[PDB]
Design a protein around this ligand. Structure first.
Ligand SMILES: N[C@@H]1[C@@H](O)[C@H](O)[C@@H](CO)O[C@H]1c1nc(-c2ccc3ccccc3c2)n[nH]1
Ligand SMILES: N[C@@H]1[C@@H](O)[C@H](O)[C@@H](CO)O[C@H]1c1nc(-c2ccc3ccccc3c2)n[nH]1
Ligand SMILES: *Cc1c(COP(=O)(O)O)cnc(C)c1O
Ligand SMILES: *Cc1c(COP(=O)(O)O)cnc(C)c1O
Lengths: 810, 810
């Protein structure tokens, strides 16, 4: 039916149906009378996977014969979401499968909804990994994502009594048609042991062995017949393992626990052993695989011309000492040559400046678990500190601050320092974030090695984040400017000359309305809740965190509520305020915030005076596949972190792409978004970075805001006295308390400017034509935030590789 | 090439090749340049599985429409072995796959060897279950095998320093192309809880829930297009399970341990909780499945006309109280009606009379774990004991002996008594065994209910145990009498009129010789050991156990050795003595026996005076697929258990079928084998049942044999003094000791008659023509021991079902 969904040729359709019935009989062992929709999803999934196969074999083939430089993207997280629609989109099968399934009288859209999210990440970081893979494939790069195949992904979020409950995300229960187990490339990983010295050199002995078994997942490029690989390792016990008898066999669990579960903390370090085992496991098995693949081209000098290893934060920072261990202890290169090889191979992306997110591992942990790596780390440190001493003679304090070893009650290794020492490039993830790295957190490193520091502002793939989740907007755009923008997002600027085209204005607004209608129904059906879809859709979707300031949003919500109650008969632009996100299981305050939100919902949604002027909806189980539904439906995107705390953000970009206006602070990539659209086209409010710092110097006193702002004071009194929790009047005492005495994120500082800015949004919503011209100005300048731009920048400025857009043959 | 292997039609062959390349590309994602033999095995396995599918769907279909009475074979063990060749044989594909693979230049026989044994059993009992399935399918019965899909089967056996080491049998490591996961028919199983009483009735509450997820395996009939199902349950935790966070997820192991590992004790009870959980798990999930299938035909009166449940020993005896629980507590039938339903549904096969193999569960165990079932058991007991009292008034002692509850320091439930009480038929497994049940172990039950007691002598399937493992013998038989014998084994009597046919004599002997050559090479290649293949092949293959008397065999071996040393220049028929079998991991004495055997091998195989007159080979890792190789190669079958201890045996039958003569005691099915062949055609020696009993009454004194038999005394002295263990001279003190003071199995009683009988075997081996006429007389009368005979007897005399041989359509 729509043209960006490709051709539905009579041969293709006939062929898809034929194969759909083949898989149902042969793969699924079902006939047409007993098949459930789950079965139909499956037969469709095997039919689409069939189209990937020749392309996958041919791509892996071509890399063997061309032997280009290979990129290894190492991450503990890959937040994939569903695979079926993405695969159709990338192979131009969407319309033909739609047609094929229709003629068997099945509805594709209904089948698509049965597929489980692969939720192997927490939020922005794992999801960036996913976008990056799609972009690497679309840009023809010989790139491999490497991670852990967790048996349980991010937990499923239930609400009970307005509280978060956690359930295990058992995503493999029904099988994963997308992965291919490769038990033939199983590799040993070593743990514990001790180090002996020979005349030969150091030797790591008496280790426990855990096996790493890889699972391969196809990553198709956008219509280029390139299919790359994501390889994910699983832990398996060896068979002599432990080997009274029964118990030995049952104790094989203790080794396979390494890959059992994703750690669910977003932007927060927890120094547990099982986590460090996860990090060593993925690093050890990957390096052997990388090395094996290099030996099928004695000579390690060429290694950096054949291999780039990108580290996704510090989570795989052990790649650096592991690479040293292999080169020094097993390959017998001298120290300096090995070190040159390592530094030229490795690059580090930093994703955060929150000090509680920075990985600092206790020494006693690394000493029991990885005792050779601890030796290598010390040796790295000593040599690094000798370079600091020679460049800054006498600056003793520099030496202490720059050490990889933190002194203190418990000695720690600062993994970020290890990454900077052992990488040729260190990048941040938006311009302002990269500037903060050079000015504060890594100022010392930057003075030593200015040439290492770079910026690579994040992007999102427009395949999933536009073509796939928003076919109607994709189509009306293609109707005006063609299809070429989908792999060249800068082309969206051509849309500026349509900003006064009456028919374009109408089409952008109609697509938004259709998405609102579709999402409003999805609310009704799956969670029995009624929204007015003429209202403005105010959405804040992201992990629950104090720095992200869902609490600021709550204050605005409660204010609107209080204003309606004071003057009940006054006009007010209707809103639906939707806030969604998971809280880490032990982050008590994030759990209270979820509770505050739903408690506000209970008061607000049941007030008859309110009518349908204000609704507050907490969106349960926020995940990739729910982002695909709500983001196209949003009018207002809330990006309201304290200036200097959100490294980049990427939800922000998703919404700019999809026809929402942004109310945000000058934080993270919001700064670049505003500069691409024009500050007039954005709702900028609040402290700048500079303002937060001025506040830190004289001291943040929240009391001052509470005395000066009567509307703020009423809200605190309401929170305090049990307005929102009449059965437990003191339920929110921890929230009030934090806000008044211990708020690291200056929620009151920004309140007054936020409410004013929220009034300007309502004023523009009153004028549909102008709301939409501004929407057009946003969508039109969202080109920069394509992850294709970001990856082409990594490729040229870090990896030394040319992207191409040229199709491999079919 | 050979005619029992079916047709190799030009269309078939072309089609198999086409599909073989299809699966290699599409299923396996490999091309021809990177494929390993494991890959080729796999593509061949998916190609053959494709031929099963339409037949499987059509069979399950036909049972729904015909609605015949359904048989449920409940066993904790199913010893399957490999599936590929069996499937080809049964679908008449063997020659065409052979041809198809040859033209791709691959050797089928080499691919077949990559398949793992499904070793989900310990020995005779699990293997009988497997033969029974093949026979049920071949006889057209609507039959389902139900068990547990263990992640680890019987351990792999390594020898180190002549000792058994155990390794985990990780048979699913590479996937199982034969099973189809059916996560849609997942069923709850309940554990722990407590019982409340309502006005409604008893109610089992506050239980832990474990999920049972079924895996289906096709069981093809012999060329009849019937394909039955073996359904095996896997344990899965529920998702709210336990649900700080990480630990909850990791603790899902404690529920899934239920299906993790097969208990490895053959013919020995170990009362561990995990085992009782295994037994309840398979019973609970199966009964729900049975019941669900019955409700798609209010009325439970018809239930016994629609369902037979056969219990494989007492291992699923909880079926009986579970069936009561469902009917009484959930379906709300009164007690008596429920009881009538249960007794008419259930039948019990006993497989052993060894008192240490009998399941007696501690009460405190059933009370914590299954507290309602314990109530039901008591109620069953009380009512049963009231029937005993009314039939035998005043016989107080009868009441105590017949109780389901054993009094004692620890109260126990005698599960065998529960089975007899709650079944309409109780059968033993050979005639002499069934007679011992009625005369000793269950004399009291038999006086109460004579009509319940039956015999059903075991059989083996001739598809695996002749056509498949011994194509050459199958073929020379088909050359004379046709192919029809393969599903009608009695037809082998026609072979008696060929007992003086010179060409037949030559062919039987040539096939034996070829098998010896083939097996002798397999020894050379896989385990670097040299056998003379002109020697007589004396094999004893079975689990290692004191009652099976591998020790008797050792004594014979050592005697032959001593005789050669006394008169080194005298002629002696050369032998290769091969003994193989696993020992249960904690059965110390069985572990010492393995050690004695290999220690005898070290002395005997290195004596230059011996030459190649005597070799002693311990065959490592005895399993189904090694039985398929050694049994066709055997000349002499050793079946030498003390009279009254081996319930039936089935190895005995395998060898009669395959051209070995038998030296055995009048135990188990040896008695029927001898009577079918004629006692002249068998090497019968030793105490009868009656003789063992005479010995028990005056007392077994092993000293008396040691004083009277000088050849026996020399052997004990050699064992004692370190002849066989010169570095640890006292290594065998436990063996000598047991033999002298604590031998429950009267090894010395039988020694003297055994050695004499072994001399008669050597005398006949000297005359090839007469050895072979006698072999012919055995193979010719082995018809009775077909498991088709056994199953047709179960079907008519217990299940009330007519077998048919009529093909379903193709
Ligand atoms: N918060 C940043 C976000 O601004 C940025 O857009 C995105 C991609 O660059 O990454 C986000 C981010 N996630 C994490 C993170 C995620 C999981 C962790 C697990 C353990 C220890 C630290 C951890 C740190 N950092 N930055
Ligand atoms: N020993 C008998 C054998 O003579 C007979 O041929 C075969 C089939 O009927 O079954 C053998 C048998 N196995 C067992 C057995 C096997 C596994 C067990 C696990 C736990 C407790 C008892 C157990 C008892 N009994 N009889
Ligand atoms: C894009 C995305 C994120 C990151 O969102 P931010 O607003 O940058 O925190 C987190 N989760 C999901 C499911 C996403 O799609
Ligand atoms: C037939 C068979 C058995 C049973 O053998 P017995 O001699 O009756 O103890 C045990 N194991 C395997 C592998 C078999 O094939």
């Amino acid at each position: 039916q729509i043209s960006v969904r490709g051709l539905a040729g009579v041969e293709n359709v006939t062929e898809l149906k034929k194969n759909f019935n083949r898989h149902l009989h042969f793969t699924l062992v079902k006939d047409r009378n007993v098949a459930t929709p789950r079965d139909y999803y499956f037969a469709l999934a095997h039919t689409v996977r069939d189209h990937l196969v020749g392309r996958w074999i041919r791509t892996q083939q071509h890399y063997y014969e061309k032997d280009p430089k290979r990129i290894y993207y190492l991450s503990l997280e890959f937040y994939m979401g569903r695979t079926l629609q993405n695969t159709m989109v990338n192979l131009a099968l969407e319309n033909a499968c739609d047609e094929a399934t229709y003629q068997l009288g099945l509805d594709m859209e209904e089948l698509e909804e049965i597929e489980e999210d692969a939720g192997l990440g927490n939020g922005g970081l794992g999801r960036l990994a996913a976008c990056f893979l799609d972009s690497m494939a679309t840009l023809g790069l010989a790139a491999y994502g490497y991670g852990i195949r967790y048996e349980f992904g991010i937990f499923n979020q239930k609400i009970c009594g307005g509280w978060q409950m956690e359930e295990a995300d058992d995503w493999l229960r029904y099988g994963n048609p997308w992965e291919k187990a490769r038990p033939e490339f199983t590799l040993p990983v070593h743990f514990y042991g001790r180090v002996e010295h020979t005349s030969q050199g150091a030797k790591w002995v008496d280790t426990q062995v855990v096996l790493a078994m890889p699972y391969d997942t196809p990553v198709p490029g956008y219509r280029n017949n390139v299919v790359n690989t994501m390889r994910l390792w699983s832990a398996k016990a060896p068979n002599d393992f432990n080997l009274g008898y029964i118990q030995a066999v049952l104790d094989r669990n203790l080794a396979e626990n390494i890959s059992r579960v994703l750690y669910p903390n977003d932007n927060f370090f927890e120094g547990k052993e099982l986590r460090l085992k996860q990090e060593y496991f993925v690093v050890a098995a990957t390096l052997q695989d990388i090395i094996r693949r290099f030996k099928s081209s004695t000579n390690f000098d060429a290694f950096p011309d054949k291999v780039a290893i990108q580290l996704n934060d510090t989570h795989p920072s052990l790649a650096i000492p592991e690479l040293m261990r292999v080169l020094v202890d097993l390959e017998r290169l001298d120290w300096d040559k090995a070190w040159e090889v390592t530094v030229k191979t490795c690059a580090y992306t930093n994703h955060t400046v929150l000090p509680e997110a920075l990985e600092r591992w206790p020494v006693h942990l690394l000493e029991t678990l990885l005792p050779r790596h601890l030796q290598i780390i010390y040796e790295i440190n000593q040599r690094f500190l000798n370079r600091v001493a020679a460049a800054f003679p006498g600056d003793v304090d520099r030496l202490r601050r720059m050490s990889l070893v933190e002194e203190g009650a418990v000695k720690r290794i600062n993994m970020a320092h290890l990454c900077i020492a052992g990488s040729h490039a260190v990048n941040g993830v938006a311009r302002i974030h990269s500037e903060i790295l050079k000015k504060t957190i890594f100022k010392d490193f930057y003075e030593l090695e200015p040439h290492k520091f770079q910026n690579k502002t994040n992007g999102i793939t427009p395949r999933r984040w536009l073509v796939l989740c928003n076919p109607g907007l994709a189509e009306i755009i293609a109707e005006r400017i063609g299809e070429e923008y989908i792999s060249d997002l800068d082309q969206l600027r051509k849309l500026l000359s349509y900003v006064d085209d009456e028919a374009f204005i109408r089409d952008v607004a109609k697509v938004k309305q259709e998405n609102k209608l579709k999402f409003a129904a999805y609310l009704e059906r799956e969670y029995k809740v009624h929204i007015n879809p003429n209202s403005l859709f105010d959405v804040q979707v992201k992990r629950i965190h104090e720095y992200k300031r869902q609490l600021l949003n709550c204050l605005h919500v409660i204010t609107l509520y209080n204003r309606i109650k004071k003057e009940p008969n006054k006009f007010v632009v209707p809103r639906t305020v939707m806030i969604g996100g998971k809280a880490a299981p032990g982050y008590h305050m994030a759990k209270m915030i979820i509770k505050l939100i739903t408690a506000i919902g209970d008061v607000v949604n049941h007030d008859p005076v309110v009518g349908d002027r204000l609704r507050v909806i907490f969106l349960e189980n926020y995940r990739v596949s729910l982002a695909e539904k709500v983001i196209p439906a949003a009018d207002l995107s809330e990006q309201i972190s304290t200036a200097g705390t959100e490294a980049s953000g990427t939800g922000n970009m998703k919404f700019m792409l999809n026809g929402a206006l942004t109310i945000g602070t000058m934080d993270g990539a919001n700064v670049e978004m505003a500069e691409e659209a024009g500050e007039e086209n954005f709702f900028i409010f609040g402290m700048r970075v500079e303002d937060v710092d001025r506040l830190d110097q004289r001291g943040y006193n929240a009391q001052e805001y509470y005395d000066r702002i009567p509307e703020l004071r009423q809200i605190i009194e309401q929170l305090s006295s049990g307005f929102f929790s009449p059965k437990q009047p003191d339920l929110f005492k921890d929230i009030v308390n934090m806000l008044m005495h211990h708020d690291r994120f200056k929620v009151f500082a920004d309140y007054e400017e936020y409410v004013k800015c929220q009034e300007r949004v309502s004023a523009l919503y009153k004028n549909p034509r102008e709301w939409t011209r501004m929407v057009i100005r946003n969508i039109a300048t969202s080109g920069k935030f394509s992850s294709d731009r970001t990856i082409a920048q990594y490729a040229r400025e870090i990896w030394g590789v040319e992207p191409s857009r040229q199709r491999l043959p079919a």
